[PDB]
Predict the structure.
Amino acid sequence: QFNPYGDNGGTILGIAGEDFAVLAGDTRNITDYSINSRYEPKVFDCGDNIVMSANGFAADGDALVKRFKNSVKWYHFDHNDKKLSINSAARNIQHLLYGKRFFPYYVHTIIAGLDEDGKGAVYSFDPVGSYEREQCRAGGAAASLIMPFLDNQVNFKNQYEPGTNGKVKKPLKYLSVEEVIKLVRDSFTSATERHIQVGDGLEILIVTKDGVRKEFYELKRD
Amino acid sequence: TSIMAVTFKDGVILGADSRTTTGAYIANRVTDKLTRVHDKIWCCRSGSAADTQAIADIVQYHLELYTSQYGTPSTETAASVFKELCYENKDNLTAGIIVAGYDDKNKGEVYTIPLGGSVHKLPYAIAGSGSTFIYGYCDKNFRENMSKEETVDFIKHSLSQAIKWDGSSGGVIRMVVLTAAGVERLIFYPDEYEQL
Amino acid sequence: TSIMAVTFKDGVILGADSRTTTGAYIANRVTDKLTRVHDKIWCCRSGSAADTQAIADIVQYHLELYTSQYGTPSTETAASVFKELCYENKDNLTAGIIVAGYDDKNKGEVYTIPLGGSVHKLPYAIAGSGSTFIYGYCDKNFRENMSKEETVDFIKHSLSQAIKWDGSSGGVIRMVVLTAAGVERLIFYPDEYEQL
Amino acid sequence: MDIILGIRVQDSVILASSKAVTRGISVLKDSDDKTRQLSPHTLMSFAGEAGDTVQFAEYIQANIQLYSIREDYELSPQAVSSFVRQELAKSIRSRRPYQVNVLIGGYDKKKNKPELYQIDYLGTKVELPYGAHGYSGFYTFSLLDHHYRPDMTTEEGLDLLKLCVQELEKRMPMDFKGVIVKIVDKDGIRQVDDF
Amino acid sequence: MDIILGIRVQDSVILASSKAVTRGISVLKDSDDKTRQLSPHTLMSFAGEAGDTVQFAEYIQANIQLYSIREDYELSPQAVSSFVRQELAKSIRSRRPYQVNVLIGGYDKKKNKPELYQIDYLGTKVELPYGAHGYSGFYTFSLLDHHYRPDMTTEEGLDLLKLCVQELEKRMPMDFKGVIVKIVDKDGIRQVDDF
Amino acid sequence: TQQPIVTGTSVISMKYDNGVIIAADNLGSYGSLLRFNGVERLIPVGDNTVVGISGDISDMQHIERLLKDLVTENAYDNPLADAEEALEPSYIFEYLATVMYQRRSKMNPLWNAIIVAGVQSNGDQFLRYVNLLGVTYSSPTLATGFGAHMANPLLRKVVDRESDIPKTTVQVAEEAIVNAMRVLYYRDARSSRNFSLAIIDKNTGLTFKKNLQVENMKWDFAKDIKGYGTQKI
Amino acid sequence: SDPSSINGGIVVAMTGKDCVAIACDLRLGSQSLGVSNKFEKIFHYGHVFLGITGLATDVTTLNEMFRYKTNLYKLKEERAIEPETFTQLVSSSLYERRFGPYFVGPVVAGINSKSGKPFIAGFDLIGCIDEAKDFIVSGTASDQLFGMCESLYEPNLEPEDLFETISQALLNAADRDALSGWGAVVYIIKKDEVVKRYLKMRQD
Amino acid sequence: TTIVGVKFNNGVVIAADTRSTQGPIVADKNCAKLHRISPKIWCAGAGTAADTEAVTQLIGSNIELHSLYTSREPRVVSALQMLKQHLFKYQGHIGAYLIVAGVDPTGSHLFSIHAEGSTDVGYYLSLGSGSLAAMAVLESHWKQDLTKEEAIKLASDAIQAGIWNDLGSGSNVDVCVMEIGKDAEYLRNYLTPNVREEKQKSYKFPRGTTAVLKESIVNICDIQEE
Amino acid sequence: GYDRALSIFSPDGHIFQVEYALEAVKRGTCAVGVKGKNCVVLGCERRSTLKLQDTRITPSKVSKIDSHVVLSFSGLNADSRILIEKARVEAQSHRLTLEDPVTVEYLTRYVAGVQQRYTQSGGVR
Amino acid sequence: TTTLAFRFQGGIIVAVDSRATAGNWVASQTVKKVIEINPFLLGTMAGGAADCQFWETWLGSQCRLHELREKERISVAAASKILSNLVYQYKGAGLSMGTMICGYTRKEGPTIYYVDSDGTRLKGDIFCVGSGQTFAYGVLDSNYKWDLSVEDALYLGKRSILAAAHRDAYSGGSVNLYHVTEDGWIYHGNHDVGELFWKVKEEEGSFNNVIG
Ligand SMILES: [Mg+2]
Ligand SMILES: [Mg+2]
Ligand SMILES: [Mg+2]
Ligand SMILES: [Mg+2]
């Protein structure tokens, strides 16, 4: 019997800052125990200061990103070159996903950018289109390895102020872009050590008011 | 089934056994598996008899209509029409057909169309359940540009062995010779080919 | 596998390919499928390598103990011991074995033991997945009382064809000659037998 | 849903239907009315698969109300029951059939006779003095076979119905949270608010 | 069978168990006592597959009674619960396992403390202030989590138990025909005959 | 939904300093039966692209006809069909990738794995993969089926990352490919000795080599191997 | 249905400078239903500590079995069993049930009383030993624990620093697992003092 | 898992990677897959890790008793025969896939072993999920009459192929060289090409960060005197 | 297994091993039973050759078989424990299957049956 | 998941947890399970997250079209029936929903409809849906009165979710409260269950089984 679905591995991570947002993902593509590519880009600049990644089954992932990029193009045509806001992009992606409710895109989608107040924004989707704005989100193979670490180091969960013994929480002070990138790199370095599908390289796309910048870092290739 | 087609100096010859089967019961011991789709384009059938008869009837219709409009079709063209039916309806068909024909420009040609609906042009072809047992014999004994008598002997000996080992094959050996001279039918009975 | 044993004027010769398979991966390309259970009683193995190695080890043990008590066993006796293991454990085994041996009283003998555990004494025998493709060739080319050189050629040519058509078979052609003169091992490489 | 009963006496038809609605683990409601008024003198109770029951009942109700307005005339109970049977007989060979069983209690104003019709989801219709769907009949029919008379009053019918519900509450494993009882006679449809 | 509850208060352990026995379609009995006295100050309630429940309970009872006679001494509730756990842990890897869940309520005369142990058919033991098996806990634990105090009297425990049974009778689909309630304290085991 | 009947095995490929190389054997298997021994599975499109196909042969012959039709169609009303508006490797791949994903989405796939190798207008090397599921990816080396497991490890020792491409000559690359084909013949039961190889270079164009054979094979060591454990004779 | 995730729970162990730490959650459940918040999963036989995750009936059974065996060991050997030796005993005992196994994930922690060397080890349900220098994880949130430990851990941590590291590893891992939590315990183990600390955590 | 075995001039070498996995998760990053059956007979195992280790130690134990009984140094063919007969009996349910190598008074030997009981002989062998990557290297660079230095190089290169290309394999290369007339040299972590880079940040917490309910001293000492 | 026939007939029709077992009973401390109109009393002799005995813990001569039946004995003390254990097990087995405690006659008949069995079984005294 | 809604003197209280799980893995602790259909209507999320999100914001569009066409606020009866009729069309295809459509109009007063993916549409006073529904029902049934104050009703809803969050493994994270009046719904904050549990334990004296 023919199975229309597959699993290309991969792990992605989106974090929203005060006036910025990052969307990172490893560059390794796999089937079963083989490596297809050590550098196959997974996070994409979609225009209008929006970055996107659809992790899971790569055929469905590429199809969805392609259809959204197309949706941005036609939004400009139909609405006098109006900038597609991150919240509007998110709702549009829900309809792309739910359109195949009974034969779904087998992917976990994340987009990142800035909201209309200039503050950092990340949105997260399930395969059939349910979505949520979030501060912090990992997706894919090693998501379960990364999220608990972020709860602890970004949101300071289970951390209290010394001397008070549980009475006063550690205050949620804002993180710089340099500080976030440090946490992203450490997240993927740790995931690479313990998950076989994670490795080769890490590509980070940073979004500010100035635009979209890229950073690349080597990961272990075993 | 044991079926084969072999090109030779003067053209091509098709060969077949005469056994049709439903389980272990021989539903017909004198079957004619060599089928005419055009004057000098014939085919050998294997698989479901319903499927291969339906296909051959449709091809004969297609080539009859081709001939009325564009003149005599090539053997390649006949093979293509067979392929189109076998490929596009692969899910619902169980048919393995060998197409053989004689042009004056191209002389003798053989095309084999296995289950998937692919086409393969070959100097000779073998098919059917009985063909498995004569891959070795045929590869060792086939030569290009044989005479008519040599080719009749090659097919007679080959199908003799296929019949000997395959329970699904048997009865008489039918043959159809395709040359410039015309169309000749041959038949060989058990008492002849069993003693080879 | 492609394995065979052939009796001739001076005794018997066993032949085999060297390819061992787990799916489409060739887990060993230089396997030795010709196995010694006694000085001049050998066998060819086909089926599960685990099963046929276990059986052959047990038979070698049985014949070693037979020899210590009753002297050299006959080839018929060796075949019977193989049969007893294959028949009584038919539910749990996947083994097709050809037993070949040389007595001075009985000369060259060949016994084939298929899946069920039945025994069949034959002038020559073929087995393994590759044997299907050479039933025709072997039946046409086998003669009784051939010479050593003729029998080596018959086996070389036969297994050459089996290897050519069966993906599961390949590598080198190994042979073991069993005569009054002793035991001779032969090996034939691809560059030799592919051009036949 | 679960238990639906019906009894035709001298001058009226009485329908009793359970109040419970259960979503697997929990009882979500204990006051559910499993009935729809099709016309002033015709009442239909129902039981079967969730959703389909109410969807079918309201669909039938809409159709009978449409007929009533078009012709300015109330269809006889026999005519309504035939319409309902055909809809279910059509439904059983559909892509996704209505899994709904009904009882139709009506008072025929022309013949001055009460009438009770039992129809299952296949479209199997029978006119009866008393009827039920599911397992309800297995517990109640032996009592009805014994006590039923064609000349019973409405009060005697309610008493025989109480005996049936008591037997159900004793021997049935499920808690159906009591029944809503409705009477259909020459004056129309009314609910017995204490049962 | 169905619902079995337990609560440990200041000076006693209270076990509540349903009375219904259902053979598929019909309720065959409405006065069944799903408990066995293992020793003068130890009571075990049970629920699971038909036959196996009583067979296991009586088997345990026989063994504890045998110990009591041999040593002229009553085993502590902790010791009895450990014996029972081992029997079930042994049973789960048998040819045909005992499909039985139990609660063990005992008063330890040495420590002068009530004790409640919950053990499932796998041999999973926990000591608890209050416990249950099956779906019983899903309905009752939120009430017990709120109202329970370790210094409650027996009367307060019975009242909290009544609130639990009322919630079960409201939201459970099955009619379990009420509960038999038994108290285990320093004076032994007694049955509350009006509940 | 179907099952593949007549099939083709591994296709292997890699990039080098001035272009790309691709190779595949000439066999069409019918299960374990090595039925057809003269099947060409590398199909050139123009003078800048070679498409290598594995899997179902009937579907391969269909794809071959689609590519033939693509060339015909591109030439229609196109004065620059042999110049600026010729078919690029990237155009040919994207078309195939579209078809493959559409066919899997109708639950009626073309049962193949495909590698498109070529050189673009600006001289850039093109090498990308697509299969029956519509999955696509690129890498300095690419291989299908058994090739993925055995060829890639060998080819990755020559070009391990992007920066190794300019340092790799056509002689070194072809040598690596030919060796990989020998290894596959040793170890894949559905492979043949005969194969085809194609080089697409930005300077010297498309070189298509037919009727190549696996040579320099090591078999001599087999003569010393006896039994399966304890046997000495 | 899957025996190793019916009851839920986690265990983690770490090494430091002249010390080891082992920690576990306190939950026992029947799938979605939380049953007990006092089900401790760490036991000790002399100075050797054993944590066990998995099917709770087997957790209890194995504790009773190893208490049985280490008690007989001590009577015959006239000394307490060491971590290295006990590790082999756990492996042996699990493998004897190769084709009818205990559905558990054991973790050993302790300091060798003669060499002073810190020791930890982990096992699969059938006996395979994992002897890591750094840390060992087990249970229904083992993925989460691997992620925490890999980033938080550094070698040669002092006892009071190691406490903070392992506590934060457990707590944040448990909060990302539905079947783990409801309390937690941490053991800090030195050559001749062991401190046990119950942690305050969310109770959902 | 990637494991190889290579014959050379005066002996045999075996090698293995050091990654053990549970599904997609790496359980141990520095696992020891080279097992000792006897001083000069070593084997490497793939498949069910408990089985490869249990079957090695059982046969190793019986081999030691056999060596003491017969007053002879153990033979590789004995280890092979005992392993295959044990595994055949369990019909593959004991999932042990082994490469067995060693030197004895008869000479140097190299065998492999499938879980269902089948054995084979060779000059070079590979097993595990990375066996195809390893065998590719072996088929490309193996020749007759290799030196010790050449065989170690070839074996570790074959493991590296598994490390880099197979997701089931990773971390380090372990080697064991068994030469005739010499002690077997076990080279643990012969190659270390996968050290983790320094992290960007220290995650050491301030003391008092964790909320504590209760503290208590645990009595690990026995019942005291007086 | 050890099958030797230890209890056998002699020419005069006596089984000596059974008769010598009675001599062991003759050696044991005296036991007496008296039944009144509404009670039964069991009296037992304690030989005072053993002082410095701890009477709290020393095995008592009268043993409860169930809550309603008792057993006293004369003869080998170790042998009596085996009969007492068997009787206690049978008492619980009777309650389990018949759902009624043993009658005194039934319990006696069982113990007597065990004693008889050990007079014509191989390998036992 | 645990979601509830109940009718009372001062309108409707809607209370939900915040947890989403994929097997044993906790995907999110910050899920919005109350869908703000419009300023006057609320819907709860249980079953399929997408099915509930998608079709209830769609419902908001249909309600907006209704009031544009009819120049009048849509009834809760009509709004709930648009959703139930839609999902009934898809019956068999595999939609998963269990929701409470909550509103307060002039003609109806406070109204709650339970709507299900197999077509069920029930009007009622108290509804509770999810894996932790049975725990929340217990607290609700024993403390519910029609004459509750807004302050006490808000607490009862908060407390009932806490009960479920504690016992049900698949419920937790935080509690979202809403109060539905005739003039629209009013949000009453996000309450972390971790902090809420300890606060309620101390102030109420409940959960004596748990050490704090
Ligand atoms: Mg990795
Ligand atoms: Mg071959
Ligand atoms: Mg948790
Ligand atoms: Mg919870």
